[PDB]
């Protein structure tokens, strides 16, 4: 038996790597899976516009055409039209037009100045092949999906001969007060970080740098006396939308100090200095750490196998 | 008996409207702890009934206290936008003093919890002992 944590700031990646444990190591998504989120695709592609196009106010940013305004207003409208699963041709023009206007891309381009979910464009910049009437979520759609959790669930699956009891938990600061129920005899913790939330803000706190709150966060976890022996294991997450943003926006939004190249291996890099620095007990402790992409399958399963080879060196 | 509880199955919002669906949801967010979610949703149901002002300002005020503020102790998984547009809201109430975070909530347990329930041990025995 293994009692492994899933930790973490909100969308850190946790129920992610959830999704991955199911496709590698449980049963996998069938296709009525598959189509039960298709509401949630929706969901999620309607919220996320109209996020945009509610910060252009915020932001003091126009449409890059008069006639968006109307289509705006159409989709305020629209957006319970969705929500039994059809986006109406309609619905899906209005959005189209929106997300193609250069106003709203001017907006898209800051958004870390309010909140949007990361999974935005990737189901945008697809709208024509998800509003099609048969339209039948992909697995990575699925594992894209932007459902926030509460409360505490566990799972199990077996892998190398192993029984894994798997709690997951959600992220906000409203739910951390909970996570003491599943703090006892705890084998492992998959601690989960945003690379790419250096430059935001926190849903629940607009004045909290999101990093700087895992960080905190992971200093609680590393140096809590109930996990003394419970092997620490660090996914620096989101790798890839990392890769993609620190081409345009510097880390040092986070690190004033930090006098690196913002490059993906540098920038990279010294985050992950900056949390196995707040392990005060580095002569007692080791801190597993990978990099990954939590929608990514292949990548997932090479990680969780070597993140599994320690649990059982650590359990001998 | 049958009928009845598959008929939650049905949405989200049938479950809701049948009180022993209401009690079953409740036990299992129990094992999940997340119960603060339904407790506040029917808070504010009962809320929207209120008659009088002074009784409508105070129970606002309770709600709030016990659910909404920061220092709650079933404060519900609700962003900062949405927070600070119920407190704005608290300064003089009305009867839709909670309605968009009623609404947050009322999607998180939609979205994340009810999907889990309706897979659930609890459920499943429910349906196969009804009748
Ligand atoms: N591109 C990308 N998206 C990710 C990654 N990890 C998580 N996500 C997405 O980020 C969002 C938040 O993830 P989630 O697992 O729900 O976070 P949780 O709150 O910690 O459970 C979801 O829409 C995921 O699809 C990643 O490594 N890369
Ligand atoms: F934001 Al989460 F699970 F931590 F949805
Ligand atoms: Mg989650």
Known sequence: EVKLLLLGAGESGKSTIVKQMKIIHEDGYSEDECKQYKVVVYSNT????????????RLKIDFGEAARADDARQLFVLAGSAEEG???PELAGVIKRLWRDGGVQACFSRSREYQLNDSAS???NDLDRISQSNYIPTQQDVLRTRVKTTGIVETHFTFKD????MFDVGGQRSERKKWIH????VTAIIFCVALSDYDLVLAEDEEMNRMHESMKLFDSICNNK??????????LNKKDLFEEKIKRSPLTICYPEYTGSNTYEEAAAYIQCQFEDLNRRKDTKEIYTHFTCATDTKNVQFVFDAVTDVIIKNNL | STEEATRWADSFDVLLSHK???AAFRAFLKTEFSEENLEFWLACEEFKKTRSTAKLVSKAHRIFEEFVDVQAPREVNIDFQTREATRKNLQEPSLTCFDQAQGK????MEKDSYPRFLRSKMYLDLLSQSQ
């Open chain 1, 46 to 57: 309607i919220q996320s516009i109209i996020a945009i196009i509610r910060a252009m106010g």
């Open chain 2, 20 to 22: 022993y669906g209401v």
């Open chain 1, 86 to 88: 059809v986006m109406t």
């Open chain 1, 182 to 185: 599943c703090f006892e005899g």
């Open chain 1, 226 to 235: 109930w996990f003394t022996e419970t092997s620490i294991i660090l996914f």
């Open chain 2, 105 to 108: 909530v009322h999607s998180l």
């Open chain 1, 162 to 165: 192993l029984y894994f009891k």
């Open chain 1, 122 to 124: 990737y189901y945008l």
